Amino acid sequence: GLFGAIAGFIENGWEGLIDGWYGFRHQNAQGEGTAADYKSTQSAIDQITGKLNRLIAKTNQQFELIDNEFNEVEKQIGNVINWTRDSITEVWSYNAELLIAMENQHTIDLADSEMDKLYERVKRQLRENAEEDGTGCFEIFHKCDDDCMASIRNNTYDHRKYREEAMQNRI
Amino acid sequence: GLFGAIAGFIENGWEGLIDGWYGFRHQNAQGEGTAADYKSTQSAIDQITGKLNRLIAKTNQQFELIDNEFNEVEKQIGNVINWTRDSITEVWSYNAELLIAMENQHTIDLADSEMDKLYERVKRQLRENAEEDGTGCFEIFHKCDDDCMASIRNNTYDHRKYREEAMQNRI
Amino acid sequence: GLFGAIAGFIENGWEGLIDGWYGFRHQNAQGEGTAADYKSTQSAIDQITGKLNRLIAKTNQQFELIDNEFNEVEKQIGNVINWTRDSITEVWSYNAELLIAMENQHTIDLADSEMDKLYERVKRQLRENAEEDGTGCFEIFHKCDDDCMASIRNNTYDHRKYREEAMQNRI
Amino acid sequence: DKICLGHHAVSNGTKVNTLTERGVEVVNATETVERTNIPRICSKGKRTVDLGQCGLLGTITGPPQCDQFLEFSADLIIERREGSDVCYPGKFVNEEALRQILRESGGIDKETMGFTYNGIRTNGVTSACKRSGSSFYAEMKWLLSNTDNAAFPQMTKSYKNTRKSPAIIVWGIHHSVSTAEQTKLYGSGNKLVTVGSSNYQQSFVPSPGARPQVNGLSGRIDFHWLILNPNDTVTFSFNGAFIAPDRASFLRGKSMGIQSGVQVDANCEGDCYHSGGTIISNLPFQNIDSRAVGKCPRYVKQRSLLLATGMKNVPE
Amino acid sequence: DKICLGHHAVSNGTKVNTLTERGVEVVNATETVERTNIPRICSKGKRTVDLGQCGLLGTITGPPQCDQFLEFSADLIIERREGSDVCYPGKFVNEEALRQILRESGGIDKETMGFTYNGIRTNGVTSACKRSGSSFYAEMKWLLSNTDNAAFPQMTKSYKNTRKSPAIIVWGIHHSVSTAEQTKLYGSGNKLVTVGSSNYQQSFVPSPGARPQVNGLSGRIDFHWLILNPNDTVTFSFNGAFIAPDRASFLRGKSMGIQSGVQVDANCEGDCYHSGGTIISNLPFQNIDSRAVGKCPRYVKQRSLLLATGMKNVPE
Amino acid sequence: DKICLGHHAVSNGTKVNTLTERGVEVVNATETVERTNIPRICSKGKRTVDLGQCGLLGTITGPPQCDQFLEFSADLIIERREGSDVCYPGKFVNEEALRQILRESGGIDKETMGFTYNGIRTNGVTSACKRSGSSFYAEMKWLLSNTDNAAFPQMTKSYKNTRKSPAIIVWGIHHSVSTAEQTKLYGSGNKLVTVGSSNYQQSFVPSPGARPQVNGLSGRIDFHWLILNPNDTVTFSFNGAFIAPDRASFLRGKSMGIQSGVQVDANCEGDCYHSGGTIISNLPFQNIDSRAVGKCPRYVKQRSLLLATGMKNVPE
Ligand SMILES: *[C@@H]1O[C@H](CO)[C@@H](O)[C@H](O)[C@H]1NC(C)=O
Ligand SMILES: *[C@@H]1O[C@H](CO)[C@@H](O)[C@H](O)[C@H]1NC(C)=O
Ligand SMILES: *[C@@H]1O[C@H](CO)[C@@H](O)[C@H](O)[C@H]1NC(C)=O
Ligand SMILES: *[C@@H]1O[C@H](CO)[C@@H](O)[C@H](O)[C@H]1NC(C)=O
Ligand SMILES: *[C@@H]1O[C@H](CO)[C@@H](O)[C@H](O)[C@H]1NC(C)=O
Ligand SMILES: *[C@@H]1O[C@H](CO)[C@@H](O)[C@H](O)[C@H]1NC(C)=O
Ligand SMILES: OC[C@H]1O[C@@H](O)[C@H](O)[C@@H](O)[C@H]1O
Ligand SMILES: OC[C@H]1O[C@@H](O)[C@H](O)[C@@H](O)[C@H]1O
Ligand SMILES: OC[C@H]1O[C@@H](O)[C@H](O)[C@@H](O)[C@H]1O
């Protein structure tokens, strides 16, 4: 749902990748290499995290019996209580259900978010040196060795270097 | 609200279009033609759908009288009941109101979503062959007949074909 | 959270700017100037606005005593009431907490929204005349005086004028 | 040569509210609060009993009205305003709790408790409980003294719940129009009716005297009741003002009790009732009788709450 | 030559919580739980009655304190801890339900029931109910026997609700300090007070004997009550220990009852009251007295719940 | 030469529901409704009292069973089905309210009320209340007449709450198997027990007669009770059928009362109890006993509600 990346224009996703949530698969000089992006991986994690520490919570509200399991109470008040009780059970069953769906919708669309914010920051690094393949790859129009890959990966990559190269190469 | 497309940079929208939710108006060789995009149209529909089948729901919770329309009950317990009752009526009136706004906000922002995911996939097809007009059109800088339109529409359109043509044409 | 702009690729933000929420800092001919964008500023404001006028609300539901501060009521019914009562206090404390977080999450992600819709409309004006610097600036590759800045600011800026200039300048 | 993206709209759309706005035009929306009633007790499929002129508590005592009902059996039980639990004026002690029981009983099944009587009458009848001529409650017996003023010889009787289900035991105290007249019936002195179950004990002494004519009669018989358990015994110790139960009443099962003023209709089936008819919907919220029973939508105050099923409607 | 977009910030912002974070700095936020009380019953515009030393149930019986109030009329009714429903020790049977009635009555309007008396006293007074000297309840009459030990000739009286509204009928039973002293007043034997309405019957026999001195008097008069309907009749059969009602009391309309310890103030107008003052707000949640009445915000446990009204505050 | 972005997945994931979908595969999710019970009263740290064969109300009266408990002291109080509040058949008037008091008492502390007796017995014992041989309630005294049929000389006693906390005063009425036998014990006539506190008055007359044998005895003693205030006095006026309280009972503090069928366990500490054990969780919702007490998660109907903790799982 939403945002476009996860199950969408990024055509499925990667069982290979086990170092985090997000990452880069490349191919160049040596061949294929895959290395997870810890800042996008920890951004998602640190947000889900914050939900669990809200919902996994210590309700100090105490309640006590009004009721009796062993010598059932007067009939009239007993029926009022169950009513009141069940009237509430409803509310919470509703409240719980809806909470879990609301947050699963946001948990998911939150994941799709952190991916569209990565793709579209690696387009801002790679200026006019490369192009949008369609499904979630850039075409680095010019060679990029396993130190040039690593310069995109740790956000140094100067596009000034290879701009002169790509300028023509891209024709 | 949000996302930018629906009532925003796409300056209003199309009463003409009756084949779905989303679509393409073009002009070329013959002139103007409009054909709805069934995958974006059914993606929105299938998501709204899923809401209705959640809210339009069979609550088996039964409740029975504690109360009496004909010979009103004791005065004391009667006032407790109404209280308890009205205390709840409040809760649900709140709960309902808020549910409907929450989901209308998401229903809407969900629509705006599926449009920004279309515009920005037809930019990924059309590589460096065309440009962002402003309000929701690309300028195909090179002719595209009513079989070339149809190649964008069913996601075949190779940008390699017309790249050579647009390269200069775009100057 | 979400959307990428506010605290993200826009590396922090501007204590200088006091004329609204959003704006443009430039540098050119004369030097630096900052002028707030009232349509994006009022779009955010008009949306938050609409929340407050929902939550700041006149609940006509009346309630009365069932209870007694001065000559405490019978013991049995008294314990039922507190129960019922506290059973509710729970519900609202839950309901309130969750409402405020849900809307603060949307209030925030709503702000990040109106910024990504500005950046990415000033890219649609500036066609192929400029480039994405990385952190939230375009490089107008060609001079833009303090009437050319103002043409982007009030959404006139024709990219046809300076396209010829930027075409080469950008190499 | 060019290409445009966009979305649909319509001539006029439906105004809904969002989290941030009060009244955005959208394409299709649908209503989320049920407003439409049906003025009948939609009873298709269901074993139904419309008591009419019988009042629910009458199905234990057995006045004239409640004759067709002394062993009713049901899925739904409808109660009527016309209906009445008594013939000889008086009332049921701890009334409304009992109805809350019988409404959910699935109907009752009677069994005699087997009391016979040495040295009194077994038979006292009134002009307000009319069968052929003047009669009484069918499940009960007005126990008197043999002739005017004579001895009510102090008695004890007892009934063991044979069955695995609990019973309902009923009996009445007779508040006779005066102390003078309390004699004319039962004889003089402290008139003690005592009632020992086992998970319950208690006693009842009539309070005779003046009180205005109802069905043109100045007396009262009020009925009391207990739930007798599997295996238990009740014991009835008394010396006057006692209406003796012929039969104990057991519950058949499970039922819905409602109260209504509208008629039955076997055509339309429904599970959400109230005194104005039947709430047939699939909507999460109803705005109809906030005491609707059965399996309902939720009551809300709101008349309408429009949920969007389309995008923003934007024309030029 | 270049162009930059961005957003505002400030030196220091306000910490709120989001769905995923506990304390993000944002620009402007506002508080969503009302904490600020006003220590007075903000009563502007409103027809108010501060009972003070009258206790709400006193407005039917009419002790000394409740003299200025026997026909009060109101929008708001304030009850005080100083206040009291009695002069001759005793209490009201089924008390708190009655107050729940009178609080919402809009005030009461009295009418005499028209009982006169052949062959007794009509007038019994006590040193605890002081008017000029020693007096009694104004809406009631201590009915005795003519002289010491003499006959209380068995009586019956009756009042028809003439009006279209329901009434409130009151009466008292006198538990005299001993069986010896029950005679000194009314005469000997089983002292039966009986009370037949029509949608209600019942009886009362005094229980005399020892119980410690309150206002230096060892007796008790406890009051009982019923709601008499349009057209109905109540009937009062008795032979002693009876406090007879002079007047029946009808309800004027609609009112808010509160209980408080703070003073009135006509300057500030408000609709959410409690015993500590007046909750004036437009906020959806209050954290003040969880038994606040009137039209309130919702009680919550939380002291503060900060709702954001700006973006993320990010400085360098 | 190229570069690709993307995200993780797995062989198979966990199905959850979203706002728009019923069952999207996601990577890691976690369960949000507690289902796992512990079949014991997890009581680590806590001053606990398992009454067993004592019934909570027995800790005031003091039957045989409740001997080890007449001054219990506690954080948790466990009640058992085996347990019982009585030896001489009968029951407690207004029972369940009292337990709701004692459960939260933190345990009780006794003090004698100091009644001695001129001209009666002080000592009546039964074969059902067995200590050494046949005995009685320890906190009470069966007050009789000196010899068979003899005078019960009319009495009055009184106890002032010395302390700053409220007390609990108890006493019993004896419903003797017959009027004949009411004499054999106390002597004849209207047997009036009267009970004046100050914020409470009332009286009790035994109703003797037939009712079936329980512990092979056909009589009943039912107990009544009041909360006596700081400074107040209670007064006990009577002439027969009276069980006199030796001691008044004060509350120590604060406790949790539960009812259970499972055993204690000092190993595992917990705050959410019910009759099936102990709900140890940090989950917001439990699906276990909807009458769980203590500090619990919320009951819900749902068995499982899976909350997502990862992205969409998409493989090829
Ligand atoms: C209230 O609920 C419990 C069990 O859920 C049941 O056993 C109890 O008797 C109920 N009471 C009535 C009268 O329905
Ligand atoms: C409780 O609510 C009903 C329905 O609105 C009302 O008619 C009834 O009399 C209420 N009870 C009291 C005592 O106000
Ligand atoms: C119910 O609530 C209030 C809490 O402020 C308390 O003082 C009152 O006495 C409670 N009732 C009982 C029976 O404890
Ligand atoms: C009831 O009592 C009988 C007496 O013969 C006994 O055999 C049986 O176990 C009991 N059964 C039930 C269901 O109460
Ligand atoms: C009350 O009784 C009188 C008898 O004179 C009658 O005329 C009137 O219609 C009755 N009913 C009502 C509702 O006022
Ligand atoms: C209780 O009575 C005594 C009399 O000796 C008195 O001095 C004291 O103030 C009273 N009240 C309390 C709460 O101690
Ligand atoms: O029902 C009321 C009246 O009915 C008459 O037929 C009867 O003869 C009268 O004694 C009186 O009882
Ligand atoms: O009020 C209590 C006391 O007051 C005295 O004035 C009166 O003479 C006494 O008889 C006693 O009643
Ligand atoms: O089970 C009760 C019976 O036990 C006997 O031992 C006793 O002598 C009888 O009087 C009777 O009390």
Please state, in angstroms and rounded to a whole number, the distance separating the CA atoms of residues C66 and D143. 44
Q: Please name the chains neighbouring D, where neighbouring means 3+ C-beta pairs under 8 angstroms.
A: A, B, C, E, F
Report which residue type is found at D16: V
Please state, in angstroms and rounded to a whole number, the distance separating the CA atoms of residues B97 and D300. 9
Tokens matching residue B126: 């059309």
Q: Is residue F129 classed as helix, strand or coil in its secondary structure?
A: strand
Burial degree of B155 (CB within 10 A; 0-12, 13-18, 19+)? exposed
Please state, in angstroms and rounded to a whole number, the distance separating the CA atoms of residues B102 and C51. 11
Tell me how long chain E is: 316
Q: Please name the chains neighbouring B, where neighbouring means 3+ C-beta pairs under 8 angstroms.
A: A, C, D, E, F
Half-sphere exposure of A33 (CA within 13 A, CB side): 14
Which H or E element spans position C97?
helix C75-125
Q: Read out DSSP for C116-157?
A: HHHHHHHHHHTTTTEEE-SSSEEEESS---TTHHHHHHTT--
Please state, in angstroms and rounded to a whole number, the distance separating the CA atoms of residues F187 and F146. 10
Minimum Cα–Cα distance from E199: chain B residue? B71
Tokens matching residue E277: 């003052």
Report which residue type is found at E61: T
Which CATH number does the domain housing residue A67 bear? 3.90.20.10
Beta-carbon contacts of residue B24 (< 8 Å; ≥ 6 apart): B34, B35, B37, B149, B152, B153, D3, D4, D5
Please state, in angstroms and rounded to a whole number, the distance separating the CA atoms of residues C44 and F300. 39
Please state, in angstroms and rounded to a whole number, the distance separating the CA atoms of residues B21 and B6. 11
Strand partners, E306: E31
Q: Is residue D11 classed as helix, strand or coil in its secondary structure?
A: coil
DSSP-derived secondary structure letter, D14: E
Which one of B98, B105, B132 has the shortest CB-CB distance to C124?
Answer: B132
Per the CB < 8 A criterion, the answer to whether B153 and B36 are in contact is no
Cβ-defined contact of F175 to D201 (cutoff 8 Å): yes
Q: How was this structure determined?
A: X-ray
Cβ-defined contact of C79 to F94 (cutoff 8 Å): no
**E216 Cα–ligand 8 center, Å:** 8
For the beta carbon of residue D113, count every other beta carbon within 10 angstroms.
21
Beta-carbon contacts of residue D183 (< 8 Å; ≥ 6 apart): D149
- The yes-or-no answer to whether E1-46+263-316 and E47-262 have a common fold is no
Q: How far is CA B125 from the centre of its chain?
A: 22
Q: If you search the block for the tokens 């609707």, which residue do you land on?
A: D292
Which H or E element spans position B126?
none
Cβ-defined contact of D295 to B133 (cutoff 8 Å): no
Per the CB < 8 A criterion, the answer to whether E78 and E278 are in contact is no
Per the CB < 8 A criterion, the answer to whether C82 and C153 are in contact is no
Please state, in angstroms and rounded to a whole number, the distance separating the CA atoms of residues F122 and F118. 9
Torsion of CA E179, E184, E186, E190, to 10 degrees: 20
For the Cβ of D127 lying below 6 angstroms from any atom of ligand 7, the answer is yes
Tokens matching residue F201: 């008055």
Strand partners, F129: F135
Tokens matching residue F75: 């954080």
Q: Please name the chains neighbouring E, where neighbouring means 3+ C-beta pairs under 8 angstroms.
A: A, B, C, D, F
> Which residue is closest in CA terms to ligand 2's atom 1?
B82
Please state, in angstroms and rounded to a whole number, the distance separating the CA atoms of residues D95 and D118. 32
Residue C55, domain extent: 1-171
For the beta carbon of residue E234, count every other beta carbon within 10 angstroms.
25
Atom of ligand 1 nearest to the CA of D104: 14
Backbone CA torsion sign across B59, B60, B66, B70: positive
Which one of E158, E233, E237 has the shortest CB-CB distance to D209?
Answer: E237
Per the CB < 8 A criterion, the answer to whether C163 and C125 are in contact is no
Q: How far is CA E149 from the centre of its chain?
A: 38
Please state, in angstroms and rounded to a whole number, the distance separating the CA atoms of residues A107 and A99. 12
CA-CA distances (angstroms) from residue E48 to E51, E78, E154?
10, 8, 44
Strand partners, D264: D41
Per the CB < 8 A criterion, the answer to whether F245 and F189 are in contact is no
Cβ-defined contact of F201 to E211 (cutoff 8 Å): yes
Per the CB < 8 A criterion, the answer to whether C111 and C40 are in contact is no
Beta-carbon contacts of residue B125 (< 8 Å; ≥ 6 apart): A134, B152, B155, B157, B159
Which one of F26, F307, F314 has the shortest CB-CB distance to A55?
Answer: F307
Strand partners, D248: D111
DSSP-derived secondary structure letter, F30: E
CATH architecture of structural domain E1-46+263-316? Ribbon (2.10)
Please state, in angstroms and rounded to a whole number, the distance separating the CA atoms of residues E143 and E115. 11
Nearest-5° Cα angle at F290, F289 to F296: 85
Instruction: Identify which ligand lies nearest to the alpha carbon of F166.
Output: 6
Q: If you search the block for the tokens 């497309």, which residue do you land on?
A: B5
Contact status of C14 with chain A (Cβ, < 8 Å): no
Backbone φ and ψ for E285, nearest 5 degrees, come out as -130, 135
Report which residue type is found at B72: E
Tokens matching residue F83: 């347990």
- Beta strand D108-112 with D193-196: parallel, antiparallel or unpaired? unpaired
**Which chain B positions have a beta carbon within 8 Å of F22's beta carbon?**
50, 53-54
Residue (of A82, F250, C150) closest to D104 by Cα position = A82
Q: If you search the block for the tokens 């994941």, which residue do you land on?
A: A111
Backbone φ and ψ for E147, nearest 5 degrees, come out as -130, 170
Beta-carbon contacts of residue F231 (< 8 Å; ≥ 6 apart): F160, F161
For the beta carbon of residue F151, count every other beta carbon within 10 angstroms.
13
Cβ-defined contact of D100 to A76 (cutoff 8 Å): yes
Please state, in angstroms and rounded to a whole number, the distance separating the CA atoms of residues C74 and C67. 10
Per the CB < 8 A criterion, the answer to whether E268 and E42 are in contact is yes
Residue (of A70, A92, A93, A73) closest to A81 by Cα position = A73
Atom of ligand 9 nearest to the CA of F217: 2
What is the three-state SS of F142-163? ECCCCCCCCCCCCEEEEEECCC
Strand partners, A13: none
No. of helices (H) and no. of strands (E), chain E: 3, 28
Please state, in angstroms and rounded to a whole number, the distance separating the CA atoms of residues E266 and E269. 7
Per the CB < 8 A criterion, the answer to whether E244 and E157 are in contact is yes
Beta-carbon contacts of residue C129 (< 8 Å; ≥ 6 apart): C140, C141, C142, C159, C162, C163, C165, C166
Atom of ligand 5 nearest to the CA of E231: 1
Contact status of C131 with chain A (Cβ, < 8 Å): yes
Nearest-5° Cα angle at E105, E100 to E111: 120
Report which residue type is found at D50: D
Which one of E96, E199, E227 has the shortest CB-CB distance to B76?
Answer: E96
Tokens matching residue D120: 């009194």
Report which residue type is found at A4: G
Residue ranges of the alpha helices (H) in B26-147?
Answer: 38-55, 75-125
Residue (of D99, D70, D43, D58) closest to D262 by Cα position = D43
CATH architecture of structural domain D47-262? Alpha-Beta Complex (3.90)
Report which residue type is found at D138: A
Tokens matching residue B131: 């440009």
Residue ranges of the alpha helices (H) in A56-135?
Answer: 75-125
Which one of D96, D199, D227 has the shortest CB-CB distance to A76?
Answer: D96
Residue (of E12, D3, A58) closest to F296 by Cα position = A58
Contacts 24+ apart (CB under 8 A), F42-45: F42/F265, F42/F267, F42/F268, F42/F269, F42/F270, F42/F273, F42/F277, F42/F278, F42/F280, F43/F76, F43/F264, F43/F265, F43/F266, F43/F269, F43/F270, F44/F266, F44/F267, F44/F268, F44/F269, F44/F270, F45/F269
**Which chain A positions have a beta carbon within 8 Å of E4's beta carbon?**
none
- Beta strand F247-251 with F193-196: parallel, antiparallel or unpaired? unpaired
E-assigned strand segments in F155-282: 155-160, 169-175, 193-196, 203-204, 220-226, 233-238, 242-245, 247-251, 256-259, 263-265, 272-274, 277-278
Give the neighbor-by-neighbor strand order of the sheet with E285-286: E33-34, E285-286, E298-299
Strand partners, F158: F235
Backbone φ and ψ for F161, nearest 5 degrees, come out as -50, 100
Number of folded domains in chain A? 1
For the beta carbon of residue B71, count every other beta carbon within 10 angstroms.
13
Ligand 6, CB cutoff 6 Å, lining residues: F 164, 230-231
Backbone φ and ψ for F49, nearest 5 degrees, come out as -135, 115
Tokens matching residue D290: 């906030």
Residue (of D31, D70, D23) closest to D49 by Cα position = D70
- Beta strand E263-265 with F242-245: parallel, antiparallel or unpaired? unpaired
- Beta strand D76-79 with D48-50: parallel, antiparallel or unpaired? parallel
Contacts 24+ apart (CB under 8 A), B9-12: B9/B134, B9/B135, B9/B136, B9/C117, B9/C121, B9/C124, B10/B115, B10/B119, B10/B135, B10/B136, B10/D5, B10/D6, B10/D7, B11/B135, B11/B136, B12/D9, B12/D314, B12/D315, B12/D316
Q: If you search the block for the tokens 């990385």, which residue do you land on?
A: C134
Beta-carbon contacts of residue F265 (< 8 Å; ≥ 6 apart): F40, F41, F42, F43
Q: How far is F131 from chain E (nearest CA, A)?
A: 35
Report which residue type is found at C92: W
Half-sphere exposure of F9 (CA within 13 A, CB side): 18
Instruction: Identify which ligand lies nearest to the alpha carbon of F163.
Output: 6
**Which chain F positions have a beta carbon within 8 Å of B50's beta carbon?**
19-22
Backbone φ and ψ for F7, nearest 5 degrees, come out as -140, 165
Tokens matching residue E66: 């409740």
Tokens matching residue E227: 């709601």
Residue (of F199, C71, C80) closest to E99 by Cα position = C71
- Beta strand F298-299 with F285-286: parallel, antiparallel or unpaired? parallel
Tokens matching residue F59: 């800790």
Please state, in angstroms and rounded to a whole number, the distance separating the CA atoms of residues B52 and B44. 13
Residues of chain F contacting B, Cβ within 8 Å: 19-22, 301
Report which residue type is found at D150: A
For the beta carbon of residue C50, count every other beta carbon within 10 angstroms.
15
Q: In chain E, where are the structural domains located?
A: 1-46+263-316, 47-262
Give the resolution value in Å. 3.5
Residue ranges of the alpha helices (H) in F40-153?
Answer: 58-61, 95-103
